[PDB]
Amino acid sequence: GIHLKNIQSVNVRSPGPHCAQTEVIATLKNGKKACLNPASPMVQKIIEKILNK
Amino acid sequence: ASVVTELRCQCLQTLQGIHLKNIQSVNVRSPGPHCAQTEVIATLKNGKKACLNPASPMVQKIIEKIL
Amino acid sequence: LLDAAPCEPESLEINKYFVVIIYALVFLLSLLGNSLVMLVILYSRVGRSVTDVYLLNLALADLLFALTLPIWAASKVNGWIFGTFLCKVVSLLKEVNFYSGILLLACISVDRYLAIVHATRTLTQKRYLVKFICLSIWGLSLLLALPVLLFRRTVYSSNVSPACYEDMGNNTANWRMLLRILPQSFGFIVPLLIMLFCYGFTLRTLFKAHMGQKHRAMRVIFAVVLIFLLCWLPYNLVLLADTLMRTQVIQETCERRNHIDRALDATEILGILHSCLNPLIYAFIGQKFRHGLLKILA
């Protein structure tokens, strides 16, 4: 449950040979990388708001 | 890895119409100190990189389909 | 139009390795020179003329700038790994000392103009306000350096290592471009105009007299002006080119981006030489300082 104001960027990695599960990695303003659950609609909402930004 | 005195937008032109069958991953950067616009960068399976227009509904549809 | 694609950045090892040596050498020379000048000025209280105070303040500014150099060299090496507080403090100190150094050069030029062209008139007596003028210059430098303190932090990116950049919000790029006007106006154009005017009239009045040492003074003035130009003009021109490119006046391309980045770094290296060179051009080229330094060896 990372707040929007702290998210700097989002990277979405699709399934591949090295990983069978979709990954969402959020890079925060403080430089720490966090993992997000793809199934959570909050991530999709965050992405939509960022795109509309 | 590298040192740069000043930061710039990672994209110059804005392409559209990428086939998801070739896309391997997608990165989205909100407008920060780096640049004044939201940037979407798609890395394909062959190692090439492409830039997507944030305003294109097709880009948003592709991103959500990836998720 | 598949030609469009990200412009990957490129970094070299040779520049990293050589820049550290250059910065360390400049640090050593500047430290030694400023120490010598301060020692000479402070040791003896006789003959504490206005130029002595001006040179003392210039030496202090250069000493602080050199003291701040090594952290900047480390940052150039590996990127700013040293947090936010140090980014703010060091950027503040660097910019304050740079502005004060430039404005002190301008003030010394004004003093020479008052003391030569207007030697016979009643205006020259206004050159005994070194204390208040120097205080005003330092205060103006501190006022001008505020934007660095207010909007500087580390920026974490994927392509590039962390940098002690500015973070003004959504439209940070445009605001940074606007803030760049201050270093190029109160830092280059205004002092350049003042120096050119003052030294032009000084040369005009000198060339018409019959003094014995006129030629050496003319050569010294030419040397000072050329050193200032060579030290600062390249960096300012490259910065203006970068501003124009961001404004789309000149076509923007990845090759141009790399070229301008390299030019910015090289011109910053070159312009850093001013702190080391100032003790030689302004102070040690004088007879009084040399005689005093020779005396102090007792």
Side-chain angles (χ1 to χ4, degrees), chain B residues 3-6 8, chain C residues 12 15 19 23 76 230-242 245 256 258-261 263-264 266-267 269-272:
Chain B
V3 166
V4 185
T5 169
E6 315 194 1
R8 300 153 214 297
Chain C
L12 310 187
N15 86 296
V19 158
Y23 272 60
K76 296 239 152 180
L230 181 73
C231 277
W232 284 116
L233 178 76
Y235 176 74
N236 274 247
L237 286 179
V238 171
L239 214 68
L240 179 71
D242 184 3
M245 194 181 77
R256 282 190 177 285
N258 288 338
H259 284 173
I260 289 171
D261 290 5
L264 277 169
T267 46
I269 295 158
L270 184 69
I272 279 164

Side-chain angles (χ1 to χ4, degrees), chain B residues 1-8 10-15 27 29 31-37 41 49-51, chain C residues 4-7 11 76 79 155-157 159-161 165-167 170-172 176 180 239 242 246 261 264:
Chain B
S2 62
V3 166
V4 185
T5 169
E6 315 194 1
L7 303 166
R8 300 153 214 297
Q10 258 187 117
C11 298
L12 306 195
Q13 174 167 359
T14 62
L15 291 172
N27 181 26
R29 188 169 65 173
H34 310 72
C35 177
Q37 332 199 6
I41 302 158
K49 292 188 175 180
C51 288
Chain C
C7 159
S11 59
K76 296 239 152 180
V155 190
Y156 285 113
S157 309
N159 295 20
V160 186
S161 56
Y165 208 59
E166 290 78 359
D167 175 66
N170 298 125
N171 225 27
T172 298
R176 189 153 168 290
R180 259 214 289 253
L239 214 68
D242 184 3
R246 287 193 198 247
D261 290 5
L264 277 169

Side-chain angles (χ1 to χ4, degrees), chain A residues 8-9 27-31, chain C residues 153-158 167 170:
Chain A
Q8 186 179 305
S9 65
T27 305
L28 309 177
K29 291 176 176 178
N30 65 2
Chain C
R153 74 150 157 69
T154 70
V155 190
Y156 285 113
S157 309
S158 288
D167 175 66
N170 298 125

Side-chain angles (χ1 to χ4, degrees), chain A residues 1-3 6-12 14-17 19-20 22 24-31 34-36 38-41 43 46-47 50-51:
Chain A
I2 293 174
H3 200 256
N6 298 337
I7 299 176
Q8 186 179 305
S9 65
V10 181
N11 181 25
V12 187
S14 301
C19 178
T22 291
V24 181
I25 308 174
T27 305
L28 309 177
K29 291 176 176 178
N30 65 2
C35 306
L36 300 177
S40 179
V43 171
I46 284 152
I47 294 149
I50 293 157
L51 293 198

